[PDB]
């Protein structure tokens, strides 16, 4: 399939990644840069993020979803359902609203695209209605992360996809902070794209710290595999 060949041919080896985020949560401003690499053959991403403005005013884990679904491993039987790659190199727009239960919300807009050989994820994040002493602005979320299925459906009328999922962030007292994600993706280009049958992506995420890093930061290792169409 000459289509499966193209956007796909972009992802067959290891691909450098750049991430840039401009954040304002309750008038708390911040910027984050990230660098790393994706190997979609194995559904694998390794990135390190740095708050370049000092202290991150929210928990790092609250940002993991926002900080690259084109790096999912789609099984051979499922290649015709990989929207993310199909949109490349021109890229796509990924927009979210993420509702933190009993707290504020983030609204994000991202452009995911190639800049030459580098895959680039440019983000703007606005958070509003947060509690200064909640689990988010009060930094009460543990530095870890649970595995999660993400359910993808076609959005045929917007020539793109809808993604819907919940993330439970562990709180220090042992309870959980629910973060309800609503997502929409649309191609940046005017060309054809693969619009998938309902399926899901399985996410495993591991959060760590660089022992030689003084700045406020996050090392993220994600494995992501498409499933749910046998």
UniProtKB/Swiss-Prot annotation:
Keyword tags: Chromophore, Luminescence, Photoprotein
Effect of residue 171 to V: In EBFP1.2; shifts the excitation and emission spectra to shorter wavelengths and increases quantum yields compared to BFP
Keyword Disulfide bond: no
PTM entry text: Contains a chromophore consisting of modified amino acid residues. Maturation of the chromophore requires nothing other than molecular oxygen.
Outcome of swapping residue 167 to T: In P11; increases fluorescence at 475 nm excitation and at warmer temperatures such as 37 degrees Celsius. In Esmerald; leads to brighter fluorescence. In VisGreen; leads to brighter fluorescence
Pfam families, per the entry: GFP (PF01353)
Protein name: Green fluorescent protein
Gene: GFP
């Amino acid at each position: 399939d000459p289509m499966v060949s193209k956007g796909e041919e972009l992802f067959t080896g290891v691909v450098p990644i750049l991430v840039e985020l401009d954040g304002d949560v309750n008038g708390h401003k911040f910027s984050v840069s990230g660098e790393g690499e994706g190997d979609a053959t194995y559904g694998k991403l390794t990135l390190k993020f740095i708050c370049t403005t000092g202290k991150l005013p929210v928990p790092w884990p609250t940002l993991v979803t926002t900080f690259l679904m084109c790096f999912a491993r789609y099984p051979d039987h499922m290649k015709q359902h990989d929207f993310f790659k199909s949109a490349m190199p021109e890229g796509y727009v990924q927009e979210r609203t993420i509702f933190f239960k009993d707290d504020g919300n983030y609204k994000t807009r991202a452009e995911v695209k190639f800049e030459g050989d580098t895959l680039v994820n440019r983000i703007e994040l606005k958070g509003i209605d947060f509690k200064e002493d909640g689990n988010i602005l009060g930094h009460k979320l543990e530095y870890n992360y649970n595995s999660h299925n993400v359910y993808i459906m076609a959005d045929k009328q917007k020539n793109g996809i809808k993604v819907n999922f919940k993330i439970r962030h562990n709180i220090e007292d042992g309870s959980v902070q629910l973060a309800d994600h609503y997502q929409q993706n649309t191609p940046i280009g005017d060309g054809p794209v693969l619009l998938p049958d309902n399926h899901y992506l399985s996410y495993q995420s591991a959060l760590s710290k660089d022992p030689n890093e003084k700045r406020d930061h996050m090392v993220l290792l994600e494995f992501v595999t498409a499933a749910g169409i046998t």
